[PDB]
Amino acid sequence: SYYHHHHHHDYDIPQGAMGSMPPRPSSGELWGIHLMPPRILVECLLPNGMIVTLECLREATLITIKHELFKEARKYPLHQLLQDESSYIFVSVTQEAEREEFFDETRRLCDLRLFQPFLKVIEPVGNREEKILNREIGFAIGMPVCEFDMVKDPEVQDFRRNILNVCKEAVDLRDLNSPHSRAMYVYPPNVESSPELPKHIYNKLDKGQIIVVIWVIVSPNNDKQKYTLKINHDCVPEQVIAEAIRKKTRSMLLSSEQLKLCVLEYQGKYILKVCGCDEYFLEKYPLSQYKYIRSCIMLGRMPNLMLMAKESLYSQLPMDCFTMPSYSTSTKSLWVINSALRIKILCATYVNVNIRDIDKIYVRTGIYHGGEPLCDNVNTQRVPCSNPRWNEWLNYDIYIPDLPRAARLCLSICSVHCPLAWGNINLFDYTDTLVSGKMALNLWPVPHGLEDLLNPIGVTGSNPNKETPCLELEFDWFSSVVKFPDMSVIEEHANWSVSREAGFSYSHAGLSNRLARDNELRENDKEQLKAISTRDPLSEITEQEKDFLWSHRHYCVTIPEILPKLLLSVKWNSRDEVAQMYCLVKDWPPIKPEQAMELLDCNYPDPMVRGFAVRCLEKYLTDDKLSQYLIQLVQVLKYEQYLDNLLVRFLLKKALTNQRIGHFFFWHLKSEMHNKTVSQRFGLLLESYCRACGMYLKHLNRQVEAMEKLINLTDILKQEKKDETQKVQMKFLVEQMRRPDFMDALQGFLSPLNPAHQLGNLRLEECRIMSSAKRPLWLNWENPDIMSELLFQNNEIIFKNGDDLRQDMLTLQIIRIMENIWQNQGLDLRMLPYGCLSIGDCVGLIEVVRNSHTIMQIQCKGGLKGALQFNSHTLHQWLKDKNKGEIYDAAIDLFTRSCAGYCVATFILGIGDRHNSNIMVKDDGQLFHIDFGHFLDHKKKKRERVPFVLTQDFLIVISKGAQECTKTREFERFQEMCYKAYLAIRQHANLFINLFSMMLGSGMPELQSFDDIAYIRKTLALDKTEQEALEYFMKQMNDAHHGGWTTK
Amino acid sequence: LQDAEWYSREEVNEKLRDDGTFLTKMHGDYTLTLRKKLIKKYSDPLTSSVVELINHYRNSLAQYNPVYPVSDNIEAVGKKLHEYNTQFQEKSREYDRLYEEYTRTSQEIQMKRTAIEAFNETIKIFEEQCQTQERYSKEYIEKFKREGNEKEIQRIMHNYDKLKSRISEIIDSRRRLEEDLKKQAAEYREIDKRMNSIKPDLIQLRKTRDQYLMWLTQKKLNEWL
Ligand SMILES: N#Cc1cccc(N)c1
Secondary structure (H helix, E strand, O other): OOOOOOOOOOOOOOOOOOOOOOOOOOOOOEOOEOOOOOEEEEEEEOOOOOEEEEEEEOOOEHHHHHHHHHHHOOOOOOHHHOOOHHHOEEEEEEOOOOEEEEOOOOOEOOOOOEOOOEEEEEOOOOOOOOOOOOHHHHHHHOOOOHHHHOOOOHHHHHHHHHOHHHHHHHHHHHOOOOOHHHHHHHOOOOEOOOOOOOHHHHOOOOOOEEEOEEEEEEOOOOEEEOOOOEEEOOOOHHHHHHHHHHHHHOOOOOOHHHHHHHHHHHHOOEEEEEOOEEEEOOOOOOHHHEHHHHHHHHOOOOOEEEEEEHHHHHHHOOOOOOOOOOOOOOOOEHHHOOOEEEEEEEEOOOOOOOOOOOOOEEEEEEEEEOEOOOOOEOOOOOOOOOOOOOOEEEEEEEEHHHOOOOOEEEEEEEEOOEEOEEEEEEOEOOOOEEOOEEEEEEOEEOOOOOOOOOOOOOOEEOOOOOOOOEEEEEEOOOOOOOEOOOHHHHHHHHHHHHHHHOOOOOOOOOHHHOOOOOOOOOHHHHHHHHHHHHOOOOOOOOHHHHHHHHHHOOHHHOOHHHHHHHHHOOOOOOHHHHHHHHHHHOOOOOOOHHHHOHHHOOOOOOHHHHHHHHHHHHHHOOHHHHHHHHHHHHHHHHHOOOOOOHHHHHHHHHHHHOHHHHHHHHHHHHHHHHOOOOHHHHHHHHHHHHHHOOOHHHHHHHHHHHHHHHHHHHHHHOOOOOOOOHHHHHHHHHHHHOOHHHHHHOOOEEEOOEEEEEEEEEOOOOOEEOOOOOOOEEEEEEOOOOOHHHOOOEEEEEEEOOOOOHHHHHHHHHHHHHHHHHHHOOOOOOOOOOOEEEEEOOEEEEEOOOOEEEHHHHHHHOOOOOOOOOOOHHHHHHHHHHOOOHHHHHHHHHHHHHHHHHHHHHHHHOOOOOOHHHEEEEOOOOEEEOOOOOOOOOOOOOOOOOOOOOOHHHHHHHOOOOOOHHHOHHHHHHHHHHHHHHHHHHOOHHHHHHHHHHOOOOOOOOOOOHHHHHHHHHHHOOOOOHHHHHHHHHHHHHHHHOOOOOOO | OOOOOOOOHHHHHHHHOOOOOOOOOOOOOOOEEOOOOEEOOOOOOOOOOHHHHHHHHHOOOOOOOOOOOOOOOOOHHHHHHHHHHHHHHHHHHHHHHHHHHHHHHHHHHHHHHHHHHHHHHHHHHHHHHHHHHHHHHHHHHHOOOOOOHHHHHHHHHHHHHHHHHHHHHHHHHHHHHHHHHHHHHHHHHHHHHHHHHHHHHHHHHHHHHHHHHHHHHOOHHHHOO
């Protein structure tokens, strides 16, 4: 009766059930097995040809193993044919299939990444032992350096040798005014962008003063002493250092004049540390302008600095010691070539198709510039579905001189209408040489979101994976290597192309592409241009507007900010036009970085444009702002045509100029090394960084090693220890963490979430596996700072093996940026964008916020006894329970200030639906969201959603217990914060579009193409006027809530 | 003029999605969105209506500036939306599962390939080692003459026996990888194969489900979807 007695015969019961943890799988300490057995046999191949098999412990060092090998080899034959043991080094085949010599004989048998458990004994060949520490480099990069040396392609080799230009120049800046400048590389001052202070920070100062606390140390360094100055906010470290020495050294045995002299011989020997972490105040900024201070002000905290002698600081700094590695008029112009383009398709080989399902298959083709320079074509649907071979010159309606520098062929095999594979080639190579001859393009399979035929925003180049559709082809050969024009030549052609237009005559209908208004344009025009200039990148421009722009291009220099719209309004298929655009760009007024970043997205692939864009960054983009946007800048390298380019040279330099940038620049590259779209590019780039970065390589190698311990550890917990009790697993976890290899590897190192914090010594009692099915590890470290207690005695961060962090990571960044927007425009909403860092393929790190609880814990703890119900006041009650006195009043301000911001950010982004277990509240009353999920509304493919719907719980707390909260001023306030915030983001909406646009590079399913990003238009309502948009938001917010939100 | 069959930017992209097809007040009036192109009496040649301007150019846009007018139960055509939407979402999981298996099998394979390079490298070093001992072992048979003759050479030959038979095990271990490499590489061709047959029928299912939702809208929808 239930199922109308309908059977499902197919259905049998004998990764949905316990459906969590879907990445996998990475082999560990040996081949085929995650974690070598605690005792193990190893076949030792000797110089005398004898095999002796030692039983060693997993954890044994090579020094220990050698010492025993040569003891136990006396007992075997041919002993007299062995030299003293010291005359030998170890070697084996590793899991990357290379023969690594083992020089650092402290290393343990598990940590070697062997393939088969066997060591060969030998004398150290290649007497520069020193040089064969690019194992160091290869370890950091996670692919051996010799793997580049056997690459044929000259671009790669050329990148490798030429990029050293950058490495040498950056290292010359470091040892300029050393040791200070070295300390400045290593410990670069962590400083806000502006010295100017927001009003709400200022008002915490009583006419610009903060109580500070300078600590100092005395014999035998154990006893420390406070010195609480009350100084100006905008005074500098040296002024503060003086006052702390004044106070330390006033005395009843020193006159004032005697003091003044004792200040001068002391004042410049010291510098200001932060108690609890390795931050320093090495240069003249307003104390306020340092990040640490400003946080201390906002949190109502007293800064706790330390006087540190410079010699104890230049003690610790090493020598960075850079070395050069072992790897150290003509034939034709394109504009001569008087044919159109034709490209020959030959034979796709490895195509996997059901002859039953599919009728017919063909090769669609096109030429592109991000958007395309001719009507797209195919070829005829020949030898379909079964060994397909076309032998057709395809004919593209475009002259060969009208191909732009960055022109690209995009192609794809399809089904009848449905793409099988794809791949795109650059029509010019890195040396400017037109592509002629026979090419072997291996193809890429179509992604999730992409249904379209051809995919041109896809990566330029072949797949490296051999066993894929290998569609070979032939390019027209013109009896000479055809090259792209010089710039000197494109200049001349423009100078002629302009002078020629000045004599074209009276009537030109299709006025479109030329002024006719001359030096005197109309004023209705001049305001319709700045009207275009305001529009975001996704408000698509019409042919009329395009042509209108293109004619007035010379007045467009007045409005530099128009440039993206202008550049998109060029006919890139008309070199006459293109040659003129190059001449404007040549000296176009530099613009703001947040606007110039648009120009490094996929829609602006020209080298001259991207040049001008980097030029802007070189001028305006501070080391601060670079850090903020580094994620997008790494991602945008993908869209560069060639390995060696201006953007790579810019970042690489900054990276080797500032070690805090360096750090994240390593990790963001290192993250994506799994991805074959970038393994080459990033591998090479990372080799450069790693060869030039000084002692930070050794620090990275420690971080790296620690992560790969945790990768193996969680990897076992998720395969062989699934279907065990937490009890059993947790026993296994703590057993393993106590082995000395784990103790070595997981104790003395820097937090990759923030390398200022040091991790020392695991407290294994506070280390535990969380409940989640992904088996994330809660890890806890002792802060080994001299003033640990002043900041945090314990540092704890979560490591997650199963889950892709980079959605979160971007939303978190996107929040951090809304926060700064809001605050630097005087209005306080306190977002808590916690730390997140992806370090690999669905592997990552999340900052723990101590003293916070999922609303669901508040309710589970607020246990109305007996399972009757949870009370909506329980949050309010729980919050009261914490904050009592005038404190309570301020905690509701905080809750109300955070709750507003998070409501707007959430709404605009359209992050996952919010609920009890993914909202969090802190003892002091701040609220913040976690586990964001799919950002730009990714389940709508299956609405303008409101994810944060403020239930009673929250509303009660916004007003202070009042009933019918809808109608308090407590709430009126809250609403006006929401409206002021909503609009704040709407004046910066270009930036957010742009940040999202730059992130299409990454293979994020939620960012496949621009209409994914287009959601953020609706939700901001950029087509509307702000007062309509206001009312749209109020409208959207009102329907989700069922009352409130009208009569502004 | 209002109905006109063909008559904001976001949804028009999703209606032009997948060469010739076509369809703020203060900026301008109406927009012609031709796919190959947004194009603004109703430029220079102005001569009466919006229906007037489209019927002329349906018969090319080259001479204007230097190339498909694509556009009764209610409750039961609304169940169909739930039906095709359960089919379409059923189909997505199948396409999503297999894109993971494909990529895992791309890795599992390429992991195997490396391991074979590794084995082969290992074996070289073992083959180089039996070579290594024949040099010195056979210098250390003749050099001795009679001393320890078999009490030495047995235990030299024993070692040598273990060496090459350990080689024997490796080579067989490699072969056994290579067999499974092809089995994996077969399954890999099978994953692609079925992805290519699901894909065309995924898009059609999607397309009908849109037109079924188009025809209705000519808040209630969310329970079906
Ligand atoms: N117009 C237009 C258009 C259509 C698709 C993509 C982009 N970038 C532009």
